[PDB]
Every structure is written in structure tokens, then in C-alpha cells.
Amino acid sequence: MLLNLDVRMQLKELAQKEFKEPVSIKLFSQAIGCESCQTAEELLKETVEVIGEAVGQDKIKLDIYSPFTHKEETEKYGVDRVPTIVIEGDKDYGIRYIGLPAGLEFTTLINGIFHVSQRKPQLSEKTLELLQVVDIPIEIWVFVTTSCGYCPSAAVMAWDFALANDYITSKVIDASENQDLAEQFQVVGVPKIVINKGVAEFVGAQPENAFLGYIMAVYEKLKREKE
Amino acid sequence: MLLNLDVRMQLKELAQKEFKEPVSIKLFSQAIGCESCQTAEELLKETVEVIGEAVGQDKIKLDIYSPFTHKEETEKYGVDRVPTIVIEGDKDYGIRYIGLPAGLEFTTLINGIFHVSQRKPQLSEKTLELLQVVDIPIEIWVFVTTSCGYCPSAAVMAWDFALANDYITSKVIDASENQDLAEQFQVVGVPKIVINKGVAEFVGAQPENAFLGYIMAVYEKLKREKEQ
Amino acid sequence: MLLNLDVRMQLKELAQKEFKEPVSIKLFSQAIGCESCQTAEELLKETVEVIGEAVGQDKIKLDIYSPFTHKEETEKYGVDRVPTIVIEGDKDYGIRYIGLPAGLEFTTLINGIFHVSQRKPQLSEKTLELLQVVDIPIEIWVFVTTSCGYCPSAAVMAWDFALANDYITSKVIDASENQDLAEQFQVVGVPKIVINKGVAEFVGAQPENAFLGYIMAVYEKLKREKEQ
Amino acid sequence: MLLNLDVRMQLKELAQKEFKEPVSIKLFSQAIGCESCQTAEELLKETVEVIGEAVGQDKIKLDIYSPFTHKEETEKYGVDRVPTIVIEGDKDYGIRYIGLPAGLEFTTLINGIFHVSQRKPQLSEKTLELLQVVDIPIEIWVFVTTSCGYCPSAAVMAWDFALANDYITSKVIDASENQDLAEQFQVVGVPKIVINKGVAEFVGAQPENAFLGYIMAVYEKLKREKEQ
């Protein structure tokens, strides 16, 4: 298929070995008049199908929404561009993927699914103790490419932070499919992390504590401004 | 087909609720050198077929012209790029789509058809009364991409202004298919609105009143210069 | 086949009525890795086949060169980008087409072939008398699109000036296939005429005398700074 | 075949006269969402096959990697975009092509393979002597288009500088396939050279010495800064 046997084999293997709680995946796309635009649907369908036949079709569902036919569901999840993927559980953690999760970013999609399934972020207690003080909306953007070997670790880490805090939204953005944003935030080297559209910016997959530092720096500044 | 079942059903439902007066659509396309022209022809054929099925085939027509075999028709509508789409009623309101209205821009196409059908712009009386003073050619360009959720509202609003005044022409332009123009007007974030090739420019789907403001500022400047 | 039966018949009679002296056509292209880049070759081959059928397949020939295999030939003519088309008689008049002459530009290609064949420019005697004093290299570029109805006139006119003077080179450039040049010289409305890469610039299909005025202005400035 | 007989015979002939030491080519491709990747694979397979036929299948090889299947290889070569082409000998000189080396850029690809085979930069002794002082990472980017005749010269020169110094990396970037980057570095005219992402920039195929100047001016600025 779109995913050769070799890949489908180790995926179900990881699924039964890593999957825990139910996962809900929603794709918002409008491929009208564009072929390639519907590759995201096929890739997602195949991955959820493989995971399902490994842990149970009742533990992971994929819903594809066209904003033309489902305008309300689109506004509910705050989608403003397509394709936008939502990975969630019983609740929405603000985890998003803007683009096609192919290539090495397939690793990103898979881990995100398992982390949401495990309902636990891969973050230390010390990080979580300080992170809990953040109570002002924080938006983390992680610009990636499907070929950069270092992007997955930064993308998943950003998802972990959003998974751990109700005020944090993390979006992994494929630069090639979002050139307007890539140019606006001067994305050259990747991964490039942008927080609250510019308050903080850094490049490279940083250590957990360094990442926390940039987040706190944004919260610290947003707090002051809040008089 | 380009439009699947649920889309056609949605489209049919909308047409029955919103269509009114007759609408005439004109597509300028070329056989060679135009990668998206063939996709545009098919997209428009299906769209017109579906709406006509829901409101009456005779109420909406599509004419496809190749510039080579229709030089005069091409000049009449001021076409200099393909694909170019004209949506008009009995009169030409200066409404144009330059590029392929795929993805989220399909919504733009659909709404443009219905606003023209209703022969009424979704603009307030406040806006329409002032817009009456505009009597010097104003050209509005809205640069968009097919994946941006904010472009449709900006695109349709530009079309409404064109629909409301005979001196206003509004063109929704796909930035990806028209990179040369986008680069010359520093298009980065979309939608980006450009009035009279630079006299006024702004980004984002701004409020109706703000839009009117930029338009009035341009008109005032043109008026001054016209009086010298 | 790009040229259907109807077009071929019209071309044949036009050729019988307009063709005179022999014409040589050179196409420089390198479509390696781009199948959409082979259209110029096919279009020219058919065009030349059809004209040859009407006036003698020895009165007009088409040579296609790849810079990879014919670097010297490419250099002989000042070819610096592909696709580049040369239309000449027994002598090279500096007439060039940069891009794919499709759509309405097909008529530019055809008329160009006929004017060169007749070895005579469609310029008034008054024009030719003054133009003859030009003895410093002048380069005229005409930016066009394949759907603009007014471009053919400006394009052929520029070619006539090149045909009429050994110091004048005229290149019709397709904006869409040469965006780097279209952006650099701010091509928005077409046709846009650029003389000597910026010394003079104007838009629209201008009257013979006005075109001449721009050429003279450029000649004058060039002469001045040559002796200055 | 993407390479017609004419091109293949020319390439075989050139290989016989210019190939020397073994060359290794690595292509980073993606099966999904990358249009040009497929054409790249075919283009390189044919090129390597033709060259192997002329000088021996053992003297040149091609490895194709999918980032997903070979994460380490990808990081080892600093690949972050596809298609990306690596041309090396026994070692990696930091020579890269980002995009499809089609059109005139096919010539760039070929000459790159030959210069690397010869383990010899087409640079003067003077230039090679001074370059020995460069010992701070220098990155050269050459933005090109497949239709520009001046790009091959600039692109190959940048690769020669990378070939000559272990601190210099040179990437030839197709501007059409990497518009985000081209827009960020104000690429209009081509070729456009950008050193160390902005420390120095210039356009056009400059003479060897001018090229060296920019590189030295950068090295010097970085040296002073490193000395503080």
C-alpha cells in the first residue's frame, strides 16, 4: 500500500506494546480540485487501520471533516487552515499537526498518538512542577520538514507540553505546506520553535529544560503585560 | 469527479436556499502552457451542472473561451492571464477569479455565484450609501492561497464591493499561481489586499468598515489628482 | 497535434498570400527532466511543416539545438536562456522570442515569420528615415502573456524595428516563463516594453511614432554618454 | 528516457574525456508528497548508467535514501529538504544540489560530477593558495532556475570552492522549488549567491577573483568576531 509491509509490521508491534487509552483523530481538509491534497487522508486512514487491527478498531477512530460540509466542527476545533490534524483523547489537549505527516514526521505522528494514548507527557517531575504555574494561553509552533532527522524530537516534546497544560496549545507545522508562515517567521534552519507568534523563537531540538525556559520566558512576559 | 457526493449534496442544498436571478460564468483557458486550466474547466462544469440541477439548468450557464479563438471576448473582459473566471449577471460587475478556485477557495466561488445571483452585496446600508460617491476606476486585488481559512471572507467582501459599484473591479488572485505579482507586492501573509496596484495595501480579513476606509482613502487621493 | 485542421488551413492560405523570401528558424531549448518543456519544439515543428507545405518545404526550415550538445551554436546567437527562438532570413536581424508562443502569441510568431520573409518592416517612410541614424546597440524587450489581445501588435512592431536596423535587437518575452525578468522589470500590465534594460520603459500597444520616440530617447542618451 | 540519444551520446563522450577517480552520488528522496523526487531518481539513475557504461560501472555509483528508512544517513549529510543530491569522492566535500537538476542545470550536475571525479577544482593556483587560510565554516548558497544560462557557471564555481576547502559547503538551490527560501533572501534575478545566510550576497556569475573576494571578506569578518 502507501505504507509497505515492513513499516506496517513494526507499527502494529509498537501499537500493542505502547497503546493504552483510546485515541481520537480528526482531519480537517478540503481537497476539492486538488489530487495530492487528499494524500493526508490516505496516510491517516492506513495508520489508524494498522493500529486498529493491532489493538482494536474500538480504541482509535479517524474522522475526516471537510469545512465546506462541516463548518461547525471546523470552528469548534479552531481550524483556520487545511490540512489540520487533531490528536486527542476524551479531551482536546490543543495538539495539532498542520500539514502532511510523511517521511520522518511519520515518527512524530505515531509518538504523538501513543503519548495521547498513554495520557502522560514524557516530562520530568521538576519540569511539571514549574510548568503548572503557567495559566495564560501559550501557543507553541514547531516548524518542520519531513526530512529533518531532528524535528521529530522537538515536535513531540512540544506536544508533550500541550498535553501537560490546559493553557498550552502546540502545533507542528510543515514549512513547505505553509510557506506564508515559514516566510513570516523566517524559517530557514529547522526545527524552528515560535511561541505566541514571535514572543520567543529558537532553533534546534533543545533539552527539555531549555524548552521549559523559553516557555517560562513567554509566560513571564505575558504576565507582566497583564499588569 | 472533482466534487464528491456529499459536496454536491451540500452545494445543491445551498443553491435551493440561495439562488435567485440568472448567473453567467465565463472561463478563459488555454490548451497548452496552462497546467490548471483543464482542472478549472472540469471544476466549473460540475459546479454549474450541480447548481442548475437544483434551480433550473437555464438559470446558470458556463462559457469556456480560449484566447486564441476569441480575441475580442478576451479583450472585452480585460483578460491577461489564464485561468480567469468572470461571474456576472446581466451586467459585468468587474468580478474576477484569477487562478484555480480549489480547496477553501471553492467556497469563495460558490458564494460569489450566489451573491451575484441575488444581485445584492452583503454590505450594510451605511457602507452602500457612502460607496455611491466613488466614480473613478478602483481596482481591488485580493491575494489568496487555497488552504487559508481567512481568505474567503476577504475575497467575497472585495467582490461585494465590485458588485455594488460600477467603477470598482475586484480580482481574487491565487498567489501560488501568480508568484510574479505576489513578489512585486510583497505578498507573504494572506489574504493581502492591494488597491490600484499599490495606492493602498493591507493584510488580513479586516472589518467591512475598515475595507471601506481604505477604498475611500484611495478614491480621495485619485479625486485630488484628477482635479490636479 | 497542437494545430488542428482548421488552424492549419487558415495558416496555409495566409502563407500563400504573405510568404516571400526564405526564412530560417532556430529553437534553443533543453527540456531534460521537464516534459512540459517539449511543447515549443512540437508547436514550431508543426507550424514550419504547415507553412512549408504551402510554400515549399525548403523555403522555411527549423533547426532545434540543445545547449548541452550545441554549445557553440548557442553562443553564436546571444542565447542566454531557454527556450529562445530565432527567426531570421539570410541574415540575423536580432529578432527573438523568449518562451512558448502559444495562444494569441501564435499570431505574433506567424506575423513575425511573414515580415522576415518579406524582408520588409511595416513601418512608415518617415519612421525609417529617422531610425536610420541609430548606430548604437539598442535592445527592445516586449513582455507579454499568451492571452493578452493587445500584445501581438506591440510584439510585431518591436520585431519590425529590429528588422529595419542592424543595431536593434528585439525580444518578445513571455512573462510567465521568465518571472525573474518580469519581477525585476516590474511587469504588471502587459505588454510592457523595456529598452536597454531600463533606460526607457512604457506600457501598452503604442502608435508607431511613440515607439520611435522611446527608441530615439534611448539613442540620444546613449550617444551623449558615449561622447561624454 | 529523460535523456534522449543525443544527450546520452554527448554525455558518454564527455565522460570518456573527463572522468578519472570514482564518484559517489547520494540522492535523498521521498515516496510521498514530493513530485520532483520521482523524476530526480530516474534522472540520476539514467545519468549514472550512461556514465558507468562509458568508464566502467564500478567507477560511479548511486544510492537513494528515504529519510524515514535512513535517519542517520540523512543527519550525517545535513539533509533537511528533498530532493537533495550529494556528489562526493572518497570524502564529502559539502557539495549539494537541492532540487531537480533539470534543464540547463543538468549541465551543472554533470560538470560537478566530473570536477569531483578529477578531485580538481577549476580554480587558479592563486585562488587555491589564499583559500588555505579559511578555517571557519563557510556556507555558499547559489539560487538558480533551470532556464537561466548564467546559473551553471556560478553554481559550478561555488562547488569548486567547496571541493577545495574542508570548511566550505556549497548548495545549489532551485529557486522555484524552494520559494520560501528565495523569498527570505530577496532572490529576484539569478543566479544569486548568499554566503553564511546573509553575511554576504551578490547576483550574477562573477569572475573567479570577485567570488573569492566575497568569500575572503566573509572569512575576515568572522575571524575578527571570533577574535573577540
Automatic annotation (TrEMBL), chain A:
Pfam family, one: Thioredoxin_3
Domain Thioredoxin-like fold: 139-213
Alphabetized CDD domains for the sequence: PfPDO_like_N, TRX_GRX_like
UniProt superkingdom: Bacteria
Record Gene3D superfamilies: Glutaredoxin
Disulphide bonds in the chain: C34-C37, C148-C151
Chain segments annotated as transmembrane: none
Matches recorded under NCBIfam families: PDO_seleno_TRX
Name of this chain's protein: Glutaredoxin-like protein
Name of the gene encoding the protein in the UniProt record: gua
